[PDB]
């Protein structure tokens, strides 16, 4: 639902 | 660790006019599986912690004014604040949350620009308290100015004095968008007696002469 | 609402220890993430530190990495920061700051809202010292027409900050409170001034209530023409 997924 | 670069460092807009700064990101924020851009703004007015206005580049925070825009995609972005108001001075910030460690830009200075205004002076001497102990604090006084730029002349028995006297400025009013400064020459009490003519002369455009407030000690 | 509240800041000698503390209300603590950011006197921000909502998992800015030490008790609703070693460029307000979203990876990658109000870190050698209160008073030379300007002098203290209010608070209206200025002895000191029409002088009394925490110091000064 945390939409600020790690973009690593 | 990815550089936020923010343009200008200061700017000065008048109210109801628009304000626009940049941010620019040494790499892309922008995250190509879910098309986001990694990127806030916060406003910071003094004595008070940072207050988020935009985050994904462009979402603006529940309950931040609707004149309150941010812009831009990959390494370039903008906010935008139309029809400024006199309490939007302060520091605008940008960050970068795309990797750690988080960064924030420097900061954009946004003073509010207004009418010419001339400070009124104030001298006052030192208390008969202080004096009693060895020193004498000489304070100056200029209220409600704009723009910033002043100068502030200590004289002595009409010798311009330099080296003795340190001002302070106050942040720009939220309300009317004038500065205040303090100035204050320190002389020891055996110099301070060793002289009559205490004189503040003041510049500022909004005086079309410099002004000068003086006592004479003892009278 | 969500609140944090940061307590423990204070005067540190160089070499030092400290132990800030973050309340947090209004929020399933344990859900979110944690950081500390900082910002030098007249400088910018600085993330210094974060830790996951399960404690699990804890960050260091590489300036702090080997001194510093956050923690969290999800008992209490309270984030740590030890600070140990203290150096004077760890001179700064310090904030406590919340992941809005959740318990974002790794730790302290996002945006923060809300912060905390700050608490300051001061790292030096100087002693504590109480300020001097002396009065500004009005008179012709601070008279002109309808307004006249009467203020108090605070002297020679030492750390920041002070505080000035007027007649216990009941007087704002034209009240300028500066920015302290350090002095070449190592003190600081300002000037807290208001305007005030000067029909009221010979009637209206005018008091600055000068409050200096560090030193446990309040001096109320009368101020009279």
């Given at each position: 639902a945390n939409p600020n997924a790690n973009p690593n | 660790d990815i550089v936020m670069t923010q343009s200008p460092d200061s700017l000065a807009v008048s109210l109801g006019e628009r304000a626009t700064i940049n941010c620019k990101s040494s790499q892309s924020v922008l995250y190509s599986s879910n098309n986001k851009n990694y990127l806030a703004?916060?406003?910071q007015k003094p004595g008070q912690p940072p207050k988020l206005l935009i985050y994904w580049?462009?979402?603006?925070?529940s309950g931040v004014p609707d004149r309150f825009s941010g812009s831009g995609s990959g390494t370039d972005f903008t906010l935008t604040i139309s029809s400024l108001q006199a309490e939007d001075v302060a520091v605008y910030y940008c960050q970068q949350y795309y990797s750690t460690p988080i960064t924030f830009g420097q900061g954009t200075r946004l003073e509010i620009k207004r009418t010419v205004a001339a400070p009124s002076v104030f001298i006052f001497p030192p208390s008969d308290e202080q004096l009693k102990s060895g020193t004498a604090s000489v304070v100056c006084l200029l209220n409600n100015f704009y723009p910033r730029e002043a100068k502030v002349q200590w004289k002595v028995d009409n010798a311009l004095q330099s080296g003795?006297?340190?001002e302070s400025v106050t942040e720009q009013d939220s309300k009317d968008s004038t500065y205040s400064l303090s100035s204050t020459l320190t002389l020891s009490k055996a110099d301070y007696e060793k002289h009559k003519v205490y004189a503040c002369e003041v510049t500022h455009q909004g005086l079309s002469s410099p002004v000068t407030k003086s006592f004479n000690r003892g009278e | 609402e969500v609140q944090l509240?940061?307590?423990?800041?204070?005067?540190?000698q160089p070499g030092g220890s400290l132990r800030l503390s973050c309340a947090?209300?209004?929020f399933t603590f344990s859900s979110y993430a944690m950081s500390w950011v900082r910002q030098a006197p007249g400088k910018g921000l600085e993330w210094v530190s974060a830790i996951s909502g399960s404690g699990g998992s804890t960050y260091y800015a590489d300036s702090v990495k080997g001194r510093f030490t956050?923690?969290?008790d999800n008992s209490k609703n309270t984030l740590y920061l030890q600070m140990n070693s203290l150096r004077a460029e760890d001179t700064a307000v310090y904030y406590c700051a919340k992941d809005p979203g959740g318990d974002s990876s790794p730790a302290g990658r996002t945006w923060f809202d809300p912060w905390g109000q700050g608490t300051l870190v001061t790292v030096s050698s100087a002693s504590t010292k109480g300020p001097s209160v002396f009065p500004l008073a009005p008179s012709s030379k601070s008279t002109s027409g309808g307004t006249a300007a009467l203020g108090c002098l605070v002297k020679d203290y030492f750390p920041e900050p002070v505080t000035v209010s007027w007649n216990s608070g009941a007087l704002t209206s034209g009240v300028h409170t500066f920015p302290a200025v350090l002095q070449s002895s190592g003190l600081?000191?300002?000037?807290?001034?208001?305007?005030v029409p000067s029909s009221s002088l010979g009637t209206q009394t005018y008091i600055c209530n000068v409050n200096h925490k560090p030193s446990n110091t309040k001096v109320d000064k009368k101020v009279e023409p």
């Open positions: - | 703004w916060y406003q580049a462009s979402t603006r925070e003795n006297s340190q | 509240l940061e307590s423990g800041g204070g005067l540190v947090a209300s209004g956050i923690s969290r600081y000191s300002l000037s807290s001034v208001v305007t």
